[PDB]
RNA sequence: GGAUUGAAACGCCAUGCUCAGGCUGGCGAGUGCGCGCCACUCAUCAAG
């Protein structure tokens, strides 16, 4: 799932008037499964550093095909991972929102930074921060 | 015999724990303490 779950999280948070943000060839999107949608050539970047993934570059990303060895079936750049532009923006925005330390849904474990959330509003979201790292 | 988001893909090159430093200086097992008090080898049996 993963990318689809971030998309669903954006859908959930974007509905609320607060604690979120509403901002907005053809193919089939692998995130939503919708057919005939404008595929994205290049996904918006994901924050690195203090407000993002610790140890990564400021403009890190999840989907990238910057070298030829990573390209298959004659596809160029992110066309190798066909996802509609709106879905790409939504999942990137959700991941960035979770990566913001101001929101209490982030924890760093050695090399990796862990972000967690629930399918619906629940007190577990603010509780689990202590489970993985008790005070 | 066209296609297993496949086909190809080193964590890899190299790096003294070393230089050294008494467990030593010295301290009676010692002062003393009967194996000793008694007790028949003895009552017999030619030499051939």
Q: What is the 3-state secondary structure (H, E, C) of A46-110?
A: CCECCCCECCCCCCCCCCCCCCHHHCCCCCCHHHHCCCEHHHHHHHHHHHHHHHCCCCCCEEEEC
Q: What Cα–Cα distance (Å) separates residue A83 from each residue in A28, A40, A45, A54, A111?
A: 7, 6, 15, 26, 29
The data reach a resolution, in angstroms, of 2.7
- Pick out the nucleotide with least CA–C1' distance to A68: B8
C-alpha separations of A47 from A4, A25, A38, A103, A112 in Å:
19, 27, 24, 15, 14
Output the distance from A110 CA to B15 C1' rounded to whole Å: 28
Chain B: nucleotides below 7 Å from protein CB are 5-9
Q: Give the determination technique.
A: cryo-EM
Identify the residue whose Cα has the smallest distance to the C1' of B3. A73
Angle at A24 between CA A18 and CA A25, to 5 degrees: 155
A110 CA from B19 C1′ (Å): 39
Identify the H or E element spanning A26.
strand A26-27
Burial class (CB in 10 A: 0-12, 13-18, 19+), A97: buried
């Amino acid at each position: 799932m993963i990318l689809q779950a971030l998309h669903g999280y954006y859908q959930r948070m974007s509905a609320d008037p607060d604690a979120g943000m509403p901002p907005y060839l053809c193919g089939q999107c692998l995130i939503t499964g919708e057919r005939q949608k404008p595929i994205a050539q290049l996904h918006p970047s994901i924050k690195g550093g203090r407000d993002g993934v610790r140890g990564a570059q400021a403009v890190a990303s999840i989907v990238s095909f910057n070298n030829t060895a990573f390209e298959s079936y004659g596809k160029e750049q992110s066309i190798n991972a066909p996802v509609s532009q709106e879905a790409a923006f939504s999942y990137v925005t959700a991941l960035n929102y979770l990566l913001n330390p101001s929101n209490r849904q982030k924890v760093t474990i050695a090399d990796a930074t862990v972000v967690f959330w629930a399918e619906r509003s629940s007190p577990a979201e603010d509780i689990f921060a202590g489970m993985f790292d008790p005070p």
